[PDB]
Amino acid sequence: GYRCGDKTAIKVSNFAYNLDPDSFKHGDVTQSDRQLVKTVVGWAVNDSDTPQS
Amino acid sequence: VIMGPGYNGEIKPGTASNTWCYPTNPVTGEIPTLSALDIPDGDEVDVQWRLVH
């Protein structure tokens, strides 16, 4: 054929990757046990002759 | 022998029943130079007018 050997070339480049939030999937959900974050203690002292709130 | 476009114009050792040929006394194809065209002296626009008409 005419100019056989001058094969057409298909070039790929300039790749870019977006992200689709709606495509989200998750596996098995693990929930840990309650862990003590913090503690505050105190004393309420009543030296009067009546209950105090 | 020289082959046609279908053969991609290949020139290969061989022989054929016809043959390209070139003059043994080639003629020069140079563009002849003619006698000058003389325009009478005048204003620029007048000279151009006489030339283009």
Method for structure elucidation: cryo-EM
- Evaluated on CA atoms B41, B42, B43, B45, the torsion sign reads negative
Q: In sequence order, what are the beta bridge partners of B2? A: B11
| Cβ neighbours of B8 in A, within 8 Å | 1-4
User: Of all residues in chain B, what percent are helix, strand and coil, respectively (each to 5)?
Assistant: 25, 5, 75
Please tell me what DSSP assigns to residue A51: -
Among candidate residues B1, B27, B25, B24, the one with its CA nearest the CA of residue B12: B1
3-state secondary structure A10-46: CCCCCCCCCCCHHHCCCCCCCCCCCCCCCCCCCCCCC
Are the beta carbons of A3 and B6 separated by less than 8 Å? no
Q: How many CB atoms lie within 10 A of CB A34?
A: 6
Residue type, B28: T
Question: From B9, which residue of chain A is nearest by alpha-carbon distance?
Answer: A2
Give B15's contacts (C-beta < 8 A, 6+ positions apart).
B1
Closest-CA residue of chain A to B5: A2
For residue B15, CA distances in Å to A31, B5, B10, B20, B21 come to 89, 18, 13, 12, 14
Residues, chain B: 53
Phi, psi of B44 (to 5 degrees): -55, -50
For this entry, resolution in Å reads 2.2
